[PDB]
Design an enzyme around this catalytic site. Structure first.
Site, PDB file in Angstrom:
ATOM      1  N   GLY A   6      87.675 127.764  -8.190  1.00 59.42           N
ATOM      2  CA  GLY A   6      86.844 128.818  -8.687  1.00 59.42           C
ATOM      3  C   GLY A   6      85.412 128.617  -8.215  1.00 59.42           C
TER       4      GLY A   6
ATOM      5  CG  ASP B 285      77.394 117.525   4.646  1.00 54.41           C
ATOM      6  OD1 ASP B 285      78.453 117.576   4.018  1.00 54.41           O
ATOM      7  OD2 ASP B 285      77.254 116.809   5.638  1.00 54.41           O
TER       8      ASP B 285
ATOM      9  CE1 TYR C 297      76.970 111.212   8.126  1.00 59.71           C
ATOM     10  CE2 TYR C 297      75.914 112.889   6.720  1.00 59.71           C
ATOM     11  CZ  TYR C 297      76.927 112.501   7.587  1.00 59.71           C
ATOM     12  OH  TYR C 297      77.906 113.403   7.891  1.00 59.71           O
TER      13      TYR C 297
ATOM     14  CE  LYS D 226      80.189 114.844   5.168  1.00 61.38           C
ATOM     15  NZ  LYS D 226      78.839 114.371   5.343  1.00 61.38           N
TER      16      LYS D 226
ATOM     17  CG  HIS E  39      82.676 110.695   6.620  1.00 62.40           C
ATOM     18  ND1 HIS E  39      81.455 110.198   6.420  1.00 62.40           N
ATOM     19  CD2 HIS E  39      82.561 111.605   7.644  1.00 62.40           C
ATOM     20  CE1 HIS E  39      80.634 110.771   7.276  1.00 62.40           C
ATOM     21  NE2 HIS E  39      81.310 111.607   7.999  1.00 62.40           N
TER      22      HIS E  39
HETATM   23  N1  LIG Z   1      81.973 115.095   8.539  1.00 58.80           N
HETATM   24  C1  LIG Z   1      81.619 114.608   9.729  1.00 58.80           C
HETATM   25  O1  LIG Z   1      82.339 113.866  10.394  1.00 58.80           O
HETATM   26  C2  LIG Z   1      80.267 115.064  10.293  1.00 58.80           C
HETATM   27  C3  LIG Z   1      79.930 114.725  11.601  1.00 58.80           C
HETATM   28  C4  LIG Z   1      78.758 115.191  12.199  1.00 58.80           C
HETATM   29  C5  LIG Z   1      77.907 116.018  11.477  1.00 58.80           C
HETATM   30  N2  LIG Z   1      78.222 116.361  10.147  1.00 58.80           N
HETATM   31  C6  LIG Z   1      77.257 117.107   9.307  1.00 58.80           C
HETATM   32  O2  LIG Z   1      76.807 118.244  10.062  1.00 58.80           O
HETATM   33  C7  LIG Z   1      75.374 118.274   9.972  1.00 58.80           C
HETATM   34  C8  LIG Z   1      74.816 119.050  11.153  1.00 58.80           C
HETATM   35  O3  LIG Z   1      75.375 118.536  12.363  1.00 58.80           O
HETATM   36  P1  LIG Z   1      74.552 117.483  13.250  1.00 58.80           P
HETATM   37  O4  LIG Z   1      73.444 116.889  12.466  1.00 58.80           O
HETATM   38  O5  LIG Z   1      75.579 116.579  13.806  1.00 58.80           O
HETATM   39  O6  LIG Z   1      73.926 118.419  14.385  1.00 58.80           O
HETATM   40  P2  LIG Z   1      73.279 119.880  14.531  1.00 58.80           P
HETATM   41  O7  LIG Z   1      72.918 120.508  13.237  1.00 58.80           O
HETATM   42  O8  LIG Z   1      74.152 120.635  15.466  1.00 58.80           O
HETATM   43  O9  LIG Z   1      71.949 119.546  15.358  1.00 58.80           O
HETATM   44  C9  LIG Z   1      70.845 118.885  14.736  1.00 58.80           C
HETATM   45  C10 LIG Z   1      69.764 118.820  15.796  1.00 58.80           C
HETATM   46  O10 LIG Z   1      69.407 120.170  16.141  1.00 58.80           O
HETATM   47  C11 LIG Z   1      68.035 120.370  15.747  1.00 58.80           C
HETATM   48  N3  LIG Z   1      67.757 121.708  15.180  1.00 58.80           N
HETATM   49  C12 LIG Z   1      67.945 122.120  13.912  1.00 58.80           C
HETATM   50  N4  LIG Z   1      67.385 123.317  13.692  1.00 58.80           N
HETATM   51  C13 LIG Z   1      66.869 123.622  14.878  1.00 58.80           C
HETATM   52  C14 LIG Z   1      66.179 124.787  15.160  1.00 58.80           C
HETATM   53  N5  LIG Z   1      66.022 125.736  14.252  1.00 58.80           N
HETATM   54  N6  LIG Z   1      65.720 124.912  16.421  1.00 58.80           N
HETATM   55  C15 LIG Z   1      65.951 123.980  17.351  1.00 58.80           C
HETATM   56  N7  LIG Z   1      66.625 122.866  17.074  1.00 58.80           N
HETATM   57  C16 LIG Z   1      67.090 122.654  15.821  1.00 58.80           C
HETATM   58  C17 LIG Z   1      67.631 119.246  14.808  1.00 58.80           C
HETATM   59  O11 LIG Z   1      66.249 118.915  15.025  1.00 58.80           O
HETATM   60  P3  LIG Z   1      65.291 118.121  14.001  1.00 58.80           P
HETATM   61  O12 LIG Z   1      66.127 117.559  12.919  1.00 58.80           O
HETATM   62  O13 LIG Z   1      64.661 117.121  14.890  1.00 58.80           O
HETATM   63  O14 LIG Z   1      64.378 119.184  13.534  1.00 58.80           O
HETATM   64  C18 LIG Z   1      68.488 118.121  15.345  1.00 58.80           C
HETATM   65  O15 LIG Z   1      67.830 117.482  16.445  1.00 58.80           O
HETATM   66  C19 LIG Z   1      74.987 116.805   9.916  1.00 58.80           C
HETATM   67  O16 LIG Z   1      73.650 116.552   9.476  1.00 58.80           O
HETATM   68  C20 LIG Z   1      76.017 116.280   8.941  1.00 58.80           C
HETATM   69  O17 LIG Z   1      75.501 116.534   7.628  1.00 58.80           O
HETATM   70  C21 LIG Z   1      79.405 115.878   9.561  1.00 58.80           C
HETATM   71  C1  LIG Z   2      85.749 107.165  12.707  1.00 55.51           C
HETATM   72  O1  LIG Z   2      84.949 106.485  13.661  1.00 55.51           O
HETATM   73  C2  LIG Z   2      83.681 106.852  13.624  1.00 55.51           C
HETATM   74  C3  LIG Z   2      83.233 107.832  12.711  1.00 55.51           C
HETATM   75  C4  LIG Z   2      81.889 108.219  12.677  1.00 55.51           C
HETATM   76  C5  LIG Z   2      80.964 107.632  13.562  1.00 55.51           C
HETATM   77  C6  LIG Z   2      79.608 108.033  13.518  1.00 55.51           C
HETATM   78  C7  LIG Z   2      79.072 109.073  12.563  1.00 55.51           C
HETATM   79  S1  LIG Z   2      78.299 108.572  11.118  1.00 55.51           S
HETATM   80  N1  LIG Z   2      79.195 110.367  12.861  1.00 55.51           N
HETATM   81  C8  LIG Z   2      79.761 110.765  14.146  1.00 55.51           C
HETATM   82  C9  LIG Z   2      78.758 111.411  11.939  1.00 55.51           C
HETATM   83  C10 LIG Z   2      79.712 111.543  10.740  1.00 55.51           C
HETATM   84  O2  LIG Z   2      80.871 110.884  10.854  1.00 55.51           O
HETATM   85  O3  LIG Z   2      79.437 112.199   9.770  1.00 55.51           O
HETATM   86  C11 LIG Z   2      78.686 107.447  14.401  1.00 55.51           C
HETATM   87  C12 LIG Z   2      79.101 106.477  15.316  1.00 55.51           C
HETATM   88  C13 LIG Z   2      80.444 106.082  15.355  1.00 55.51           C
HETATM   89  C14 LIG Z   2      81.388 106.654  14.481  1.00 55.51           C
HETATM   90  C15 LIG Z   2      82.751 106.256  14.516  1.00 55.51           C
HETATM   91  C16 LIG Z   2      83.127 105.180  15.557  1.00 55.51           C
HETATM   92  F1  LIG Z   2      82.480 104.012  15.298  1.00 55.51           F
HETATM   93  F2  LIG Z   2      84.460 104.911  15.556  1.00 55.51           F
HETATM   94  F3  LIG Z   2      82.804 105.569  16.816  1.00 55.51           F
END
Ligand SMILES: NC(=O)c1ccc[n+]([C@@H]2O[C@H](COP(=O)([O-])OP(=O)(O)OC[C@H]3O[C@@H](n4cnc5c(N)ncnc54)[C@H](OP(=O)(O)O)[C@@H]3O)[C@@H](O)[C@H]2O)c1
Ligand SMILES: COc1ccc2c(C(=S)N(C)CC(=O)O)cccc2c1C(F)(F)F
Length: 315
Positions: A9, A43, A48, A77, A110
């Protein structure tokens, strides 16, 4: 349009602020600016290493009466070293304390990959290969369910699970709660419509991470395609009098996916919220989709030989 709804919900805000790579000393102001502009979803993740500083920004806003806790959707996560069933509640509790919260709105496994437990978040072996443990994520899921039972989290979900891994959970004997969310990499170069379609048919909301293809990722080799600088998407953005970032964030929203872009720059956080005011006409949507290169920024090759490594599967 504004929020999607989970099978419980609960209303999940469609735009959230991402905190990966947001440095401890900057993420507190980033979180504050975001709540001041109207962001209601943050998020987070234990790995992190900034949940304490996130927590500080939240706390300031909550006691400063700028937002009610009920108006905030805070996600964290469970990290890979904490997949053994007995380590889950501990890991959730550390995250709650750091965030200075009583409960989480969503807690995600995660990555499907469990790593050897210990203080080090990436236990490596001689060959620079990550060390697995003795656990299956279906056991971690049971422990994640007890978190819901106890009221510590309002919904549980998964992240980077391929559709066969989601199936493993859904087909689990004795399943109490099913994945409310599956957070995965989605951007023009990896549009993911089969995993999205699968998740949606199962009633699982999708959160597209790395909407802008993560320009700031550590492993960014200079001859890698920058979605932000891709002249094609600059062109569609020019037609729109909007930025590549803005249309790159609009795209998931329109496909009915939760978006969580990351920025620590205040101006950019404000830009990234200025997107609920225009629509991409179906042509544009389909051109953005035709950029599908199956290019995956978060491939994580160091994990590839792991038994539960998600990306050897088609989707
Ligand atoms: N669950 C997972 O495995 C996982 C993995 C990766 C990411 N995520 C989540 O996804 C979120 C977003 O993805 P990401 O951080 O990997 O990359 P992203 O949002 O694709 O890219 C972030 C980068 O783009 C820049 N950016 C943001 N707004 C901008 C704008 N308006 N104009 C120009 N550039 C801009 C940021 O700059 P500045 O910050 O320097 O301003 C930073 O350098 C992460 O923070 C994380 O919370 C989750
Ligand atoms: C599951 O394995 C992971 C998962 C996440 C990472 C990350 C992280 S924290 N991310 C890619 C972002 C995220 O998982 O949210 C960075 C470097 C190596 C990682 C690896 C690995 F070490 F193996 F390369």
């Amino acid at each position: 349009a504004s929020h999607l709804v989970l099978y419980t919900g609960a209303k999940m805000p469609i735009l959230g602020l991402g905190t990966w790579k947001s440095p401890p000393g900057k993420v507190t102001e980033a979180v504050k600016v975001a709540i001041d502009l109207g962001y209601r979803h943050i998020d987070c993740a234990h790995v992190y290493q900034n949940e304490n500083e996130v927590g500080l920004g939240l706390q300031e806003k909550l006691q400063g009466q700028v937002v009610k806790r009920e108006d905030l959707f805070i996600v964290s996560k469970l990290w890979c070293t904490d997949h053994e069933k007995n380590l889950v509640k501990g890991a959730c509790q550390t995250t709650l304390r750091d965030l200075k919260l009583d409960y989480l709105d969503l807690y995600l496994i995660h990555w499907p990959t469990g790593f050897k437990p210990g203080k080090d978040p990436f236990p490596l072996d001689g060959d620079g290969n990550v060390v697995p443990d003795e656990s299956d994520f279906v056991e971690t899921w049971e422990a994640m369910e007890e978190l819901v039972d106890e009221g510590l989290v309002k919904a549980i979900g998964v992240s980077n699970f391929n559709h066969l891994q989601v199936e493993k959970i859904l087909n689990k004997p004795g399943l109490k709660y099913k994945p409310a969310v599956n957070q995965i990499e989605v951007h023009p170069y990896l549009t993911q419509e089969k995993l999205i379609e699968y998740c949606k048919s199962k009633g699982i909301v999708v959160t597209a991470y790395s909407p802008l293809g993560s320009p700031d990722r550590p492993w960014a080799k200079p001859e890698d395609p920058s979605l932000l600088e891709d002249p094609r998407i600059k062109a569609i953005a020019a037609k729109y009098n909007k930025t590549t970032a803005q249309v790159l964030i609009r795209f998931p929203m329109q496909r009915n996916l939760i978006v969580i872009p990351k920025s620590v720059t205040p101006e950019r956080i404000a830009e990234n919220f200025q997107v609920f005011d225009f629509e991409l006409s179906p042509e544009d949507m389909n051109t953005l989709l035709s950029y599908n290169r199956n290019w995956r920024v978060c491939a994580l090759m160091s994990c590839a030989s792991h038994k539960d490594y998600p990306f050897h599967e088609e989707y």
